[PDB]
Design an enzyme around this catalytic site. Structure first.
Site, PDB file in Angstrom:
ATOM      1  N   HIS A  40       0.802  -1.216   0.000  1.00  0.00           N
ATOM      2  CA  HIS A  40       0.000   0.000   0.000  1.00  0.00           C
ATOM      3  C   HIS A  40       0.837   1.269   0.000  1.00  0.00           C
ATOM      4  O   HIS A  40       0.296   2.346  -0.240  1.00  0.00           O
ATOM      5  CB  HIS A  40      -1.086  -0.030   1.075  1.00  0.00           C
ATOM      6  CG  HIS A  40      -0.673   0.408   2.434  1.00  0.00           C
ATOM      7  ND1 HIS A  40      -0.354  -0.477   3.446  1.00  0.00           N
ATOM      8  CD2 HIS A  40      -0.575   1.645   2.976  1.00  0.00           C
ATOM      9  CE1 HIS A  40      -0.063   0.195   4.548  1.00  0.00           C
ATOM     10  NE2 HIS A  40      -0.191   1.486   4.288  1.00  0.00           N
ATOM     11  N   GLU A  52      18.903   7.310   8.672  1.00  0.00           N
ATOM     12  CA  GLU A  52      18.215   8.495   9.161  1.00  0.00           C
ATOM     13  C   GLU A  52      17.906   8.395  10.645  1.00  0.00           C
ATOM     14  O   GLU A  52      17.528   7.343  11.156  1.00  0.00           O
ATOM     15  CB  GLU A  52      16.877   8.663   8.445  1.00  0.00           C
ATOM     16  CG  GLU A  52      16.987   9.137   6.998  1.00  0.00           C
ATOM     17  CD  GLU A  52      17.246  10.632   6.893  1.00  0.00           C
ATOM     18  OE1 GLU A  52      17.712  11.230   7.879  1.00  0.00           O
ATOM     19  OE2 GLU A  52      16.992  11.209   5.820  1.00  0.00           O
ATOM     20  N   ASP A  84      -0.041  -7.589   1.793  1.00  0.00           N
ATOM     21  CA  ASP A  84       0.438  -6.203   1.801  1.00  0.00           C
ATOM     22  C   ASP A  84       1.957  -6.191   1.991  1.00  0.00           C
ATOM     23  O   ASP A  84       2.491  -5.935   3.074  1.00  0.00           O
ATOM     24  CB  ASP A  84      -0.271  -5.419   2.894  1.00  0.00           C
ATOM     25  CG  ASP A  84      -0.009  -3.926   2.814  1.00  0.00           C
ATOM     26  OD1 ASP A  84       0.501  -3.457   1.783  1.00  0.00           O
ATOM     27  OD2 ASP A  84      -0.341  -3.223   3.788  1.00  0.00           O
ATOM     28  N   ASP A 171       0.517   2.002  19.886  1.00  0.00           N
ATOM     29  CA  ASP A 171       0.248   1.406  18.584  1.00  0.00           C
ATOM     30  C   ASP A 171       1.148   2.066  17.540  1.00  0.00           C
ATOM     31  O   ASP A 171       1.756   3.108  17.778  1.00  0.00           O
ATOM     32  CB  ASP A 171      -1.233   1.636  18.261  1.00  0.00           C
ATOM     33  CG  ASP A 171      -1.824   0.691  17.223  1.00  0.00           C
ATOM     34  OD1 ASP A 171      -1.114  -0.153  16.642  1.00  0.00           O
ATOM     35  OD2 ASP A 171      -3.054   0.846  16.990  1.00  0.00           O
ATOM     36  N   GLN A 174      -0.522   6.166  11.196  1.00  0.00           N
ATOM     37  CA  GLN A 174      -0.285   6.696   9.860  1.00  0.00           C
ATOM     38  C   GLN A 174       1.144   7.227   9.738  1.00  0.00           C
ATOM     39  O   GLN A 174       1.620   7.983  10.583  1.00  0.00           O
ATOM     40  CB  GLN A 174      -1.276   7.832   9.602  1.00  0.00           C
ATOM     41  N   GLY A 175       1.811   6.832   8.661  1.00  0.00           N
ATOM     42  CA  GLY A 175       3.184   7.206   8.426  1.00  0.00           C
ATOM     43  C   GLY A 175       4.193   6.179   8.896  1.00  0.00           C
ATOM     44  O   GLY A 175       5.354   6.243   8.506  1.00  0.00           O
ATOM     45  N   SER A 177       3.452   2.982   8.266  1.00  0.00           N
ATOM     46  CA  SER A 177       3.185   1.939   7.288  1.00  0.00           C
ATOM     47  C   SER A 177       4.427   1.540   6.519  1.00  0.00           C
ATOM     48  O   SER A 177       5.241   2.379   6.129  1.00  0.00           O
ATOM     49  CB  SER A 177       2.180   2.468   6.270  1.00  0.00           C
ATOM     50  OG  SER A 177       0.913   2.565   6.863  1.00  0.00           O
ATOM     51  N   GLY A 178       4.552   0.239   6.309  1.00  0.00           N
ATOM     52  CA  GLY A 178       5.686  -0.327   5.598  1.00  0.00           C
ATOM     53  C   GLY A 178       6.872  -0.650   6.478  1.00  0.00           C
ATOM     54  O   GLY A 178       7.784  -1.365   6.036  1.00  0.00           O
TER      55      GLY A 178
HETATM   56 CA   LIG Z   1      18.663  13.135   8.544  1.00  0.00          CA
END
Ligand SMILES: [Ca+2]
Length: 223
Positions: A40, A52, A84, A171, A174-175, A177-178
């Site tokens: 998705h 990062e 997914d 939990d 959103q964001g 995901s993956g």
């Molecule tokens: Ca950075």
């Protein structure tokens, strides 16, 4: 991540950010040239950002590498979110060290009660919105299949598991995901979906990576 803690810079060295001008999904580095994420999260024009911590500041350990190919699972169903999972090949191999490292694929599926680490740059609030700039972490257990199916009647397939807390408060959101769910040093889940975030009796649902190991290995070997 709602109800989590600040991981610390480069403490989750397999965590990637997928960027299309902005962060939109997580993923996991599984070898020097391949990332696994959620189907998705598919879009064209992905740059993979490794190493990062703060996604808005260049801190010195980043590697920015464009995707050369994306492969969505052949049986992904966007309505049910069954299957997914997606593989992304990098244009060039990443340089691996202690701060950028791959995560092992599982040889066996994890059982309910196992404690896992979930990470990401997603929303930190269950009502409203606040997006962090640094990576957040959450420790959560895999829930039994019976509890998962009772929370989401008619929606849980054999390719999904629930993890988190039935009492709510903690939990993925959103964001996230993956991104990865790592248990005992192996990638067992991908952040997939849920009903809201951190709501009572609505734990997060994750793609069950152990069901896909053969597909991953065969795909990497031929692409
Ligand atoms: Ca950075």
């Amino acid at each position: 991540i709602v109800g989590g803690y600040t991981c610390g810079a480069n403490t989750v060295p397999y965590q990637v950010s997928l960027n299309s001008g902005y962060h939109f999904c997580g993923g996991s580095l599984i070898n020097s040239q391949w990332v696994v994420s959620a189907a998705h999260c598919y879009k064209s024009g992905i740059q993979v950002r490794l190493g990062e911590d703060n996604i808005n500041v260049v801190e010195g350990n980043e590697q920015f590498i464009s995707a050369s190919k994306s492969i969505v699972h052949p049986s992904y169903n966007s309505n049910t979110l069954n299957n997914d999972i997606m593989l992304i090949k990098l244009k060039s191999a990443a340089s691996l060290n202690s701060r950028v490292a791959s995560i092992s694929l599982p040889t066996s599926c994890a059982s309910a009660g196992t404690q896992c680490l979930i990470s990401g740059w997603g929303n930190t609030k269950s009502s409203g919105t606040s997006y962090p700039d640094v990576l957040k972490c959450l420790k959560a257990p895999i829930l039994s299949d019976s509890s998962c199916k009772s929370a989401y009647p008619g929606q849980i397939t054999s390719n999904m598991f629930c993890a988190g807390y039935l009492e709510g408060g903690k939990d993925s959101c959103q964001g996230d995901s993956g991104g990865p769910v790592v248990c005992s040093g192996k990638l067992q889940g991908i952040v997939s979906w849920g009903s809201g975030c951190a709501q009572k009796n609505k734990p997060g649902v994750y793609t069950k990576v152990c069901n896909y190991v053969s597909w991953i290995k065969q795909t990497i070997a031929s692409n």
